[PDB]
Design a protein around this motif. Sequence first.
Motif, short mmCIF file in Angstrom:
data_model
loop_
_atom_site.label_atom_id
_atom_site.label_comp_id
_atom_site.label_asym_id
_atom_site.label_seq_id
_atom_site.Cartn_x
_atom_site.Cartn_y
_atom_site.Cartn_z
N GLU A 14 41.48 40.35 37.42
CA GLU A 14 41.53 39.58 38.43
C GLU A 14 43.01 39.43 38.99
O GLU A 14 43.60 38.92 38.30
CB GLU A 14 40.62 38.36 38.34
CG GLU A 14 39.08 38.64 38.20
CD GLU A 14 38.30 37.21 37.87
OE1 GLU A 14 37.74 37.36 36.79
OE2 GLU A 14 38.31 36.61 38.65
N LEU A 15 43.17 39.56 40.07
CA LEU A 15 44.46 39.19 40.64
C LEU A 15 44.51 38.50 41.84
O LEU A 15 43.78 38.63 42.68
CB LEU A 15 45.13 40.77 41.28
CG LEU A 15 45.37 41.80 40.37
CD1 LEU A 15 45.54 43.11 41.09
CD2 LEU A 15 46.38 41.51 39.32
N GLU A 16 45.15 37.20 41.56
CA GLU A 16 45.23 36.17 42.73
C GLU A 16 46.10 36.55 43.58
O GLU A 16 47.36 36.69 43.23
CB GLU A 16 45.35 34.86 41.90
CG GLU A 16 44.12 34.28 40.93
CD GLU A 16 44.47 33.06 40.70
OE1 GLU A 16 43.72 31.88 41.10
OE2 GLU A 16 45.40 32.84 39.50
N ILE A 17 45.53 36.78 44.69
CA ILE A 17 46.40 37.12 45.97
C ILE A 17 47.14 35.85 46.47
O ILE A 17 46.67 34.91 46.72
CB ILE A 17 45.57 37.95 47.16
CG1 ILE A 17 46.53 37.79 48.55
CG2 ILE A 17 44.13 37.42 47.42
CD1 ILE A 17 45.68 38.46 49.57
N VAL A 75 37.41 42.95 47.05
CA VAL A 75 38.15 41.60 47.23
C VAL A 75 37.18 40.30 47.48
O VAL A 75 36.42 40.23 48.33
CB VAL A 75 38.82 41.64 48.83
CG1 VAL A 75 39.50 40.46 49.03
CG2 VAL A 75 39.78 42.76 48.88
N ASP A 76 37.14 39.64 46.48
CA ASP A 76 36.24 38.35 46.12
C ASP A 76 36.99 37.08 46.59
O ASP A 76 37.51 36.42 45.83
CB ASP A 76 35.75 38.28 44.57
CG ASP A 76 34.75 37.31 44.50
OD1 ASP A 76 33.98 37.34 45.30
OD2 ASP A 76 34.57 36.61 43.50
N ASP A 120 39.76 34.92 47.49
CA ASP A 120 41.19 34.94 47.29
C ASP A 120 41.69 35.75 46.09
O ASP A 120 42.80 35.29 45.31
CB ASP A 120 41.52 33.42 47.17
CG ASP A 120 41.28 32.73 46.14
OD1 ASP A 120 40.06 32.88 45.71
OD2 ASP A 120 41.93 32.00 45.39
N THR A 121 40.78 36.60 45.79
CA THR A 121 41.13 37.26 44.35
C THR A 121 40.62 38.90 44.58
O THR A 121 39.67 39.17 44.91
CB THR A 121 40.64 36.47 43.32
OG1 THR A 121 39.31 36.54 43.37
CG2 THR A 121 41.37 35.68 42.71
N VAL A 122 41.55 39.73 44.06
CA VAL A 122 41.41 41.21 44.23
C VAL A 122 40.84 41.70 42.83
O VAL A 122 41.51 41.27 41.74
CB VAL A 122 42.52 41.93 44.48
CG1 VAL A 122 42.14 43.55 44.41
CG2 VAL A 122 42.79 41.83 45.94
N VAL A 123 39.73 42.28 42.84
CA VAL A 123 39.10 42.53 41.29
C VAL A 123 38.97 44.15 41.02
O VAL A 123 38.35 44.80 42.09
CB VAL A 123 37.43 41.87 41.08
CG1 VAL A 123 36.94 42.44 39.84
CG2 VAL A 123 37.53 40.46 41.29
N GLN A 147 46.25 48.35 39.17
CA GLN A 147 46.85 46.62 39.10
C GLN A 147 48.29 46.62 39.91
O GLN A 147 48.51 46.00 40.54
CB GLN A 147 46.58 46.23 37.86
CG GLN A 147 46.90 44.57 37.73
CD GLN A 147 47.23 44.16 36.50
OE1 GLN A 147 46.41 44.40 35.47
NE2 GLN A 147 48.12 43.16 36.27
N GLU A 182 49.84 44.82 42.95
CA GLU A 182 50.71 43.71 42.70
C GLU A 182 52.26 44.25 43.63
O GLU A 182 52.73 43.53 44.04
CB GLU A 182 51.31 43.78 41.31
CG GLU A 182 50.21 42.90 40.57
CD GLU A 182 50.45 42.97 39.09
OE1 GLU A 182 50.87 44.20 38.44
OE2 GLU A 182 50.15 42.06 38.25
#
Lengths: 29, 70, 172
Positions: free
Chosen positions: C4-7, C42-43, C45-48, C66, C70
């Motif tokens: 999970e990447l918090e945008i 895109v879930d 505010d987070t890219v999964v 990832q 980023e």
Amino acid sequence: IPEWKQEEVDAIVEMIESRNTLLERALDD
Amino acid sequence: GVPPTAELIKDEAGFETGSGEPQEDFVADLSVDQVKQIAEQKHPDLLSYDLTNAAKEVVGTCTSLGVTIE
Amino acid sequence: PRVELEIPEDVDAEQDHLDITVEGDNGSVTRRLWYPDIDVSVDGDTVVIESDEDNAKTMSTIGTFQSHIENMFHGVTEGWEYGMEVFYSHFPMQVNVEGDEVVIENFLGEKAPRRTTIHGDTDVEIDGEELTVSGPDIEAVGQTAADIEQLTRINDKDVRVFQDGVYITRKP
RNA sequence: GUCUCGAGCCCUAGACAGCCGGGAGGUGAGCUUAGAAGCAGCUACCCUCUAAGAAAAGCGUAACAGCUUACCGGCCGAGGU
Ligand SMILES: [Mg+2]
């Protein structure tokens, strides 16, 4: 539990009476 | 402005040149009181707090030349 | 595996099918992230980036996906910049931007100008003997910078003697 | 290349890697040599301050300088070898 890590804590605690983790460890007791 | 260690040893010993192999070939000799004078001079050159430790540093050059102690 | 990447707040990310588009103050970058059984979504505010597979080949692309995301985040906010220096020993080299391509004239005394088209929305700015390649898409920016250096590649002669050419000096 | 199985050792008292910071005095060890100061050679390879820091592991210089090495500290956080 390396012996040097134990001997260090004792040495730190000895100075408190008279690594960051080891300093805290010594503070705790 | 105090000179290096090697010089002061050759002054209070009588000999100049060392040897090919230290400790294995004793050139000069130093007494207890003789080494105590050298430590008295070098104070800024040495980091030691006590006068005791200052002597240990000096001896760290003597044995590696061929200097016995009495 | 699931990553999970918090945008970032500066950034907004939309996604349809296999394409992911990332927008920021510095612009937008769209990429196609396609690999067997790796779902990128895109879930909020987070890219999964997830997959039911966990073999070496799948884990490799997951790590690759990832960094690509980023980097898109970084490019649409802070941007990507590469610094280049033009060096010449005898023949004065002329490096200029003409339209969507940089032109290098008089390279090693050549009559014919060497050139290369600029990729994407990449901007190339020259300050005397210094050049700065920049933009949102690190792929386009990184290639443009490399293309410029490669444009003065010399095969025939000893490079230790003939060293003229623009070189990548600063890498982000 | 990739899949599976086993053994040893290391690790939340923070391992492995990366990045940041420190990498200090005796003194350029002695000898050799006009000079050689970690790094031509021979021999020694000792102790201070300290969280560490070789009588120096790889380059570097005419010799220095300079760059990294070990070694210590931090950031990070989970497996590493
Ligand atoms: Mg030829």
